[PDB]
């Protein structure tokens, strides 16, 4: 299990699959998750910013205490139940698989 602390991911487009990770106090700014697989990865206290989620398929992933701002969730299965005590800001939720 890979523990991640204090990340600053700027302008990164993600295409591959990341699995078995936890992120804490992450600051994902201007990221982009397109056509990828989320497997057993956990987000806690992470502050998103204008990230874009497209055709992302998730399994056992769970967002916790995350501040999600200005994002777009288009063509995804990240339903409401996958978010726990999360605050959205100016965000949106488009058509979902």
């Amino acid at each position: 299990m890979k523990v991640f602390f204090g990340e600053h991911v700027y302008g990164a487009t993600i295409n591959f699959t990341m699995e078995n990770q936890i992120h804490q106090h992450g600051k994902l700014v201007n990221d982009k998750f397109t056509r990828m697989y989320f497997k057993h990865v956990l987000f806690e206290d992470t502050f998103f910013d204008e990230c874009y989620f497209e055709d992302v398929t998730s399994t056992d992933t769970y967002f916790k205490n995350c501040t999600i701002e200005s994002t777009i969730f288009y063509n995804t299965d990240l339903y409401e139940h996958k978010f726990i005590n999360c605050r959205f800001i100016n965000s949106t939720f488009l058509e979902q698989k």
Binding site: I72, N90, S91, T92, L94, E95
Partner: protein, 1239 residues
């Protein structure tokens, strides 16, 4: 089809559909041909010379009947070709009346109405009536008797006399006692009336002359309604006649109009009868149905028929809608009786058929028919099977040109009516003239109207287009009584026609001596014989009447001076252009003096034209009208008197708690009903004795203008004829263009005169009729309040208390608003009334409007209007004000130092429009801030905003705050209260209550009686104050203040008044701008493209999703789907603003490239799947769309269909088809005020 197997004429005599027939008659009648056309309906191709013995000849009688128009012919119907054409036409009219659903229900009602078999002298037996059956003689030699309902026979001696007759009985009055009998309709389809209509210019300003032919379908429908009344035995007594006064010279000499005609005409005419007589008729008919039900219960036997008594009882219980409670005890219920009576009386009317058929007809029976037109109906190229004379896809469809004789002249041929133009006439002398009878005022007598107002009333514990489709849905079918076997009657069926009451011949040639000129002299002074001699215009009637060659005119002296001058060949074109321009000049003149109440357009030259009030000067007429209101127009003042309304007596149940509250509730309800009834009586009196004179004046103006044009072009042609060959050939001229332009000038003047007469009538109603009722009625309120007070204290307390006295003081101190919307239909009248009240009340305290590049007060009270530097104005429309959260984003209004009082605001109101952006910053929660202030030194009012709510605060000197709030949630899928234009108004009665209204709907009331003294602010503040947000901004427009309290009526119409199409936000829709799309029927989905092209299509997918921010807002996404852009196709307006009825093209953006929207209309099915094509498309496909609804039109002008969607299998595709919804759409411009992020 209703009529299958067209029967030609020369088919054999088989015996069930074509056979020889014996009709009942007093004497002997030879076998007569006829053709069964349906169940219980027969059509006889012969002239009616058998039913009535007195009519043995077809020669016109020496004494012509008192009829406006009539034609006579003795060789008609004689030959077999005429018989075939007659029968084809009547069959076509039957199928056409059956085509419409309302007509379908009427035909079913006719079919079901078999007469009752009550002819047995013995009470307990059922016997068929001998006089309501026909003897069908078979080729073998024997005959069989058969019952039926309707017989269609060619006309009587008077050809155009279409009527209904019935065979009476010695002691039983069948037509009015619930029994009913077979009806014989004297009818012909080959002839039509020709009338004149002058109220169509509102829809078709390009209309020429009138002379419209009434659709024969409507006439047959009128005859069928007469029949339908007579089968159910509900005909009104013929001796009940709407009598008129005939003593005066201006009063029409005489004409019979029975109440049955008033009922069958319906609509406007149906209002000529008061509610009391209608109630009497309803009660009488209910009693007669109770009697027939009792007789049916008593009877237990039948003689003369094969089928069971039970079967005939079932048929009759279905016909009369009776109910049997499983015990053989028939009974009628008031609900079903009321439904049937309304269906037969109010639903089946001529007006409703005219509305459904979309054909011309006179709105009132006063518009007497003026010509006889021979027509041909058998060919389909002249009279289409569906839409009548208005054939679709042709030039005749537009503007109802089919019924216009002067266009569709090859279809109608005029005939010479045998009633003389001046056979029935009156004489007027001062120099004597004659007047035709049918061109006089209609003066109803006072006896025809009655009231039960004086009768007192006691209250006990318990006292108390669409509708056509609901009745059709509820209506029953598949139950038509089958043909029945009966024992045959004698060879000859004896019988006498129902006796008609005698009408004495009205006197002719009466002489009246007067000391003044009447308008008939003036109307005659403008006529001429178009002889060879020159005709000269003049300004003196005394010479125009005497000299046949001189014609009176009411125009200016320079005009007559010009028209009397001889001119030469080179000068004539300038002469004709000058005269047409000058004629338009007089016809277009309107007075500018508008200080008079809602007579805004006073037209002067009506005075000298018709000698109204005995002045001959335009200025004198204007002064007289200004001084005397609308009274001077009326020839005779209609007397109105409202006697004292009866008191109200309440019963008392000693020691009661909930029944007494019911007593007060019923008292209030009966108060409201009494107010409604008295308004209805006042309206019907006004319509009976005021509107007819105004209509006659309008007709006289129309014919006067036409006569003036006639004289002008007559003298012009006289001058034209003077030339030699070279002048007339070198200098061309035609009369058609002159006639067209003069007629267009007549129409533009006639619009003004029609509107003027409309405000005249409405103003007279509002001024000199309603106060008389309202004074007695408020006295009734005073007495009723006294009674309720005596009961509310009764010096005792064993009762059930401040709430009751509050309610009684509230409602019995105010007045119910008066509207004709609930009394009249005439759309023209409707508009004038409401438009008036709102337009006049506009003038108020502050009318802050931005025009002429400045924000000014049109109410000329505001002292100064300060404008801050940081305010903003909308370039597309300068009347919008945008206010920012900065100090200089301020507007100050210096209120008039006159209207500022310490204890003012006793009754007053405010109204304006606000658009609010969507709250973003969380600090704005519970952050109240004032947006509009009129509060000084802890006293005044303020409008404030907070998180999703509007607050109106009233505040007195002694700290008593009163806050009324209107709230709305931000977490909703679709909102009508965010970023949208919202009408907000506040009404205040410092005596009773403060009320809030939003866009014209009731929200909240709070008491303000505890408020004391509320000192008036010196000025008005427009500024954000205390708003912690650094980006908050507002939009407001059309702010208005009212010095008196308003009412629901004046506020609702105001909304529409202040309301060019709008977008989602309510702002003006604009050209060459992108817009998203939204259908109101399906809000949760958006639009999407697929494989664009001819094969490509638009469809509905989703869900649109959701954008939200925690504990601030949640809402579905709005910027979904491809954006739509609109650009001009043929609109000539320079600006990019769209208006109503604008034909434009529609394009859509797909991956940042533009596509036309178009479809192929030749595809099968009414649904027309639209498609997205490239800009280089083919012009054959329909792409022009008219404008919240949009309609696609073919390149030839045919409407492809309303743009909407259809559920094509599992795909919600888009269509242009010809549903209560699906025609509603909405455009979403990109708005910075909403803030959702696109991508």
């Amino acid at each position: 089809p209703f009529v299958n197997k067209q029967f030609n004429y020369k088919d054999p005599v088989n015996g069930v559909d074509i056979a020889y027939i014996k009709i009942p008659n007093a004497g002997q009648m030879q076998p007569v041909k006829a053709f069964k056309i349906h169940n219980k309906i027969w059509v006889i191709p012969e002239r009616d010379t058998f039913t009535n013995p007195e009519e043995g000849d077809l020669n016109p009688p020496p004494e012509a009947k008192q009829v406006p128009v009539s034609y006579y012919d003795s060789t008609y119907l004689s030959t077999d070709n005429e018989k075939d054409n007659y029968l084809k036409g009547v069959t076509k009219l039957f199928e056409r009346i059956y085509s419409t659903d309302l007509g379908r229900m009427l035909l079913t009602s006719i079919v079901r109405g078999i007469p009752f078999w009550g002819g047995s002298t013995i009470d307990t037996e059922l016997k068929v009536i001998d006089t309501n059956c026909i003897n069908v003689i078979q080729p073998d030699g024997s005959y069989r008797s058969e019952e039926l309902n309707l017989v269609i026979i060619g006309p009587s001696a008077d050809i155009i006399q279409f009527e209904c007759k019935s065979f009476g009985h010695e002691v039983l009055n069948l037509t009015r006692n619930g029994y009913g009998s077979t009806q014989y309709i004297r009818f012909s389809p080959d002839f039509t009336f020709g009338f004149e209509e002058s109220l169509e210019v509102d829809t078709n300003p390009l209309l020429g002359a009138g002379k419209f032919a009434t659709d024969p379908a409507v006439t047959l429908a009128h005859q069928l309604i007469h029949a339908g009344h007579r089968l159910y035995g509900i005909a009104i007594n013929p001796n009940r006649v709407f009598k008129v006064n005939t003593n005066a010279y201006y009063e029409m000499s005489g004409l019979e109009v029975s109440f049955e005609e008033l009922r069958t005409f319906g609509g406007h005419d149906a209002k000529f009868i008061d509610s009391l007589q209608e109630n009497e008729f309803r009660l009488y008919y209910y009693n007669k149905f109770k009697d027939i039900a009792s007789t049916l219960n008593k009877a237990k036997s039948i003689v003369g028929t094969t089928a069971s008594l039970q079967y005939m009882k079932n048929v009759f219980k279905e016909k009369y809608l009776l109910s049997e409670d499983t015990s053989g005890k028939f009974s009628v219920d008031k609900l079903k009786f009321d439904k049937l009576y309304k269906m037969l009386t109010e639903i089946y009317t001529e007006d409703n058929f005219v509305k459904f058929f979309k054909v011309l007809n006179a709105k009132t029976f006063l518009n007497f028919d003026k010509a006889v037109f021979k027509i041909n109906i058998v060919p389909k190229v002249n009279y289409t099977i569906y839409d009548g004379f208005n054939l679709r896809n042709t030039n005749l469809a537009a503007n109802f040109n089919g019924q216009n004789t002067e266009i569709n002249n090859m279809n109608f041929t005029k005939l010479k009516n045998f009633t003389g133009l001046f056979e029935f006439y009156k004489l007027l002398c001062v120099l004597c003239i004659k007047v035709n009878n049918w061109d006089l005022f209609f003066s109803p007598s006072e006896d025809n109207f009655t009231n039960d107002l004086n009768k007192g009333e006691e209250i006990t514990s318990d006292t108390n287009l669409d509708l056509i489709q609901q009745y059709y849905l509820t209506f029953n079918f598949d139950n038509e009584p089958e043909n029945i076997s009966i024992e045959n009657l004698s060879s000859d069926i004896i019988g006498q026609l129902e006796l008609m009451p005698n009408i004495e011949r009205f006197p002719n040639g009466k002489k009246y001596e007067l000391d003044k000129y009447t308008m008939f002299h003036y109307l005659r002074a403008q006529e001429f014989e178009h002889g060879k001699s020159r005709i000269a215009l003049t300004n003196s009637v005394n010479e125009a009447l005497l000299n046949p060659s001189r014609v009176y005119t009411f125009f200016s002296s320079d005009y007559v001076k010009k028209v009397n001058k001889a001119t030469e060949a080179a000068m004539f074109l300038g002469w004709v252009e000058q005269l047409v321009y000058d004629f338009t000049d007089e016809t277009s003149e309107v007075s500018t003096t508008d200080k008079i109440a809602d007579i805004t357009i006073i037209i002067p030259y009506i005075g000298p034209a018709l000698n109204i009030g005995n002045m001959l000067y335009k200025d004198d007429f204007v002064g007289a009208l200004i001084f005397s209101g609308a009274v001077i127009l009326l020839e005779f003042i209609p007397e109105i008197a409202i006697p004292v309304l009866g008191t109200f007596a309440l019963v008392s149940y000693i020691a009661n708690k909930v029944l007494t509250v019911q007593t007060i509730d019923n008292a209030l309800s009966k108060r409201n009903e009494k107010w409604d009834e008295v308004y209805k009586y006042i309206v019907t009196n006004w319509l009976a004795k005021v509107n007819t004179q105004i209509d006659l004046i309008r007709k006289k103006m129309k014919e006067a203008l036409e006569n003036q044009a006639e004289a002008t072009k007559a003298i012009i042609n006289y001058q034209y004829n003077q030339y030699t060959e070279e002048e007339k050939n070198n200098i061309n001229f035609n009369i058609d263009d002159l006639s067209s332009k003069l007629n267009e000038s007549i129409n533009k003047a006639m619009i003004n005169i029609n509107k003027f007469l409309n405000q005249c009538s409405v103003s007279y109603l509002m001024n000199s009729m309603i106060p008389y009722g309202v004074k007695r009625l408020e006295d009734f309120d005073a007495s009723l309040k006294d009674a309720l007070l005596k009961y509310i204290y009764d010096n005792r307390g064993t009762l059930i208390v401040d709430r009751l006295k509050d309610k009684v003081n509230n409602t019995l101190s105010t007045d119910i608003p008066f509207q004709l919307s609930k009394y009249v239909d005439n759309q023209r009248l409707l508009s004038t009334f409401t438009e008036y009240i709102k337009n006049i009340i506009n003038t108020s305290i502050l009318n802050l409007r931005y025009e002429s590049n400045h924000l000014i007060d049109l109410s000329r009270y505001a002292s100064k209007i300060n404008i801050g530097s940081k305010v903003n104005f909308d370039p597309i429309d300068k009347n919008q004000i945008q206010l920012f959260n900065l100090e200089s984003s301020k507007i100050e209004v210096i209120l008039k130092n006159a209207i500022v009082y310490n204890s003012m605001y006793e009754n007053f109101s405010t109204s304006f429009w606000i658009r609010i952006p969507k709250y973003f910053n969380s600090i704005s929660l519970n952050n109240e801030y004032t947006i509009i202030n009129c509060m000084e030194n802890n006293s005044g009012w303020k409008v404030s905003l907070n998180y999703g709510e509007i607050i109106w605060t009233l505040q007195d000197t002694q700290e008593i705050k009163q806050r009324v709030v209107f709230k709305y949630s931000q977490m909703i899928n679709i909102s009508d209260y965010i970023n949208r234009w919202i009408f907000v108004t506040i009404t205040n009665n410092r005596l009773n209550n403060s009320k809030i209204y939003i866009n014209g709907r009731l929200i909240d009331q709070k008491p303000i009686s505890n408020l004391g003294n509320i000192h008036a602010s010196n000025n008005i503040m427009f500024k954000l104050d205390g708003c912690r947000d650094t980006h908050r901004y507002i939009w407001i427009k059309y702010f208005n203040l009212f010095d008196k309290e308003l009412n629901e009526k004046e506020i609702k119409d105001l909304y529409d008044n202040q309301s060019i199409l709008k977008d989602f936000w309510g702002d003006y829709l604009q050209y060459d701008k992108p817009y998203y799309m939204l259908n109101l029927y399906d809000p949760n989905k958006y639009v999407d493209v697929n494989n664009v092209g001819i094969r490509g299509y638009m469809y509905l997918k989703g869900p649109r999703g959701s954008v939200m921010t925690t504990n601030i807002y949640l809402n579905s996404s709005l910027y979904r789907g491809a954006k739509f852009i609109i650009k001009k196709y043929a609109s000539g307006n320079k600006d990019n603003i769209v208006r109503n009825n604008d034909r434009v093209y529609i394009n859509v953006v797909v991956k940042n490239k533009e596509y036309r929207l178009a479809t192929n209309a030749s595809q099968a099915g009414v649904e027309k799947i639209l498609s997205a094509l490239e800009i280089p498309d083919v012009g054959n496909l329909s792409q022009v769309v008219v404008m919240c609804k949009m309609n696609l039109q073919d390149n030839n002008g045919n409407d492809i269909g309303f743009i909407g969607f259809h559920q094509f299998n599992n795909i919600a595709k888009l269509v242009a088809s010809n549903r209560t919804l699906g025609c509603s759409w909405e455009f979403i411009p990109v708005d910075d005020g909403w803030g959702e992020r696109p991508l």
